């Protein structure tokens, strides 16, 4: 399964627009009324203006070819200081057998480039903005982890209920797509920001559609 559409909010719509227009190219970013969309391979993200008094941010990982990590890292570093953790500007996660690259955007989103060494294809050609494959990860920060895992399982997603941990982060998915299901509070790696509940909507490849309210409740829309 893949993310076809992702709806996120932002308190820096104008700055966000310029940032991504400069990063992805005018041919991948469409400005709309009080919102704009960006194209990331087979995935699309619409950023909508956030409600006053709030400054939403999320953790978004973008898939890139197994052999494009170094190039992706260099490309990403041209748009912002690369984030570090343990004084390292990149990380290797053995569970996903992937290398990841991080940068913060104007609204404080943790933008990540993830290169899956075996779960992503090898593209014998130069990396470029046009080479972003799709959304590989998105955080589902909920006020009730067990309830979300349940409804997600009901939505027919790969879920091991007896393995879900309410107080921690839980990887839900397979192949090149994982939902980072967890509670608010914990600091995000490569970031000063701690997990906080913010609304969002998501439409998957299989027609499944779900949203997270401002309360943090996960609810299957479709």
Ligand X SMILES: Cn1ncnc2c(=O)n(C)c(=O)nc1-2
Single residue of 82, 155, 189, 196 touching ligand X by CB under 6 A: 189
Beta-strand relationship, 3-10 and 43-49: parallel
Q: Is the dihedral of CA 123, 127, 128, 131 positive or negative?
A: positive
Look at the block and give the residue holding tokens 């400005």.
31
Q: How far is the CB of 206 from ligand X (least distance, A)?
A: 24
Tell me which residues in 93-112 interact with ligand X (CB under 6 A). 93, 110, 112
- Nearest to ligand X of 62, 159 (CB atom): 62
24: contact with ligand X by CB under 6 A? no
176: contact with ligand X by CB under 6 A? no
Q: Which does 93 bind (CB under 5 to 8 A by kind): ligand X, Mn ion, none?
A: ligand X
Q: Looking at residue 130, what DSSP letter applies?
A: G
Q: Is 150 helix (H, G, I), strand (E, B) or coil?
A: helix
Q: DSSP readout, 13-45?
A: HHHHHHHHHHHH-GGGEEEETTEEEEEETTEEE
Q: Which does 169 bind (CB under 5 to 8 A by kind): Mn ion, ligand X, none?
A: ligand X
Tell me which residues in 141-170 interact with ligand X (CB under 6 A). 169
Q: How far is the CB of 178 from ligand X (least distance, A)?
A: 9
């Amino acid at each position: 399964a893949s993310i076809k559409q992702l709806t996120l909010y932002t308190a820096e719509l104008d700055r966000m627009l310029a940032f991504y227009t400069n990063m992805l190219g005018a041919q991948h970013v469409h400005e709309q009324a009080d919102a704009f969309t960006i194209q990331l391979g087979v995935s699309q993200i619409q950023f909508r203006a956030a409600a006053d008094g709030t400054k939403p941010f999320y953790h978004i990982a973008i898939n890139i070819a197994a052999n494009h990590f170094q190039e992706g890292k260099a490309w990403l570093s041209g748009f912002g200081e690369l984030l570090t953790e343990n004084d390292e500007d990149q990380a290797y996660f053995p569970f996903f057998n992937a290398y990841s690259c991080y940068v913060e955007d104007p609204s404080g989103n943790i933008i990540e480039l993830i290169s899956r060494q075996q779960a992503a294809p090898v593209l014998d050609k130069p990396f470029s903005a046009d080479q972003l494959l799709s959304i590989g990860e998105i955080n589902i920060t909920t006020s009730d982890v067990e309830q979300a895992a349940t409804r997600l399982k009901q939505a027919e997603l790969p879920v091991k209920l007896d393995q879900i941990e309410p107080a921690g982060l839980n990887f839900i998915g397979a192949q090149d797509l994982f939902l980072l299901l967890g509670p608010p509070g914990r600091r995000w790696l490569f970031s000063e920001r701690v997990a906080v509940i913010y609304p969002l909507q998501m439409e998957l490849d299989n027609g499944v559609s779900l949203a997270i309210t401002e309360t943090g409740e996960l609810v299957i829309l479709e």
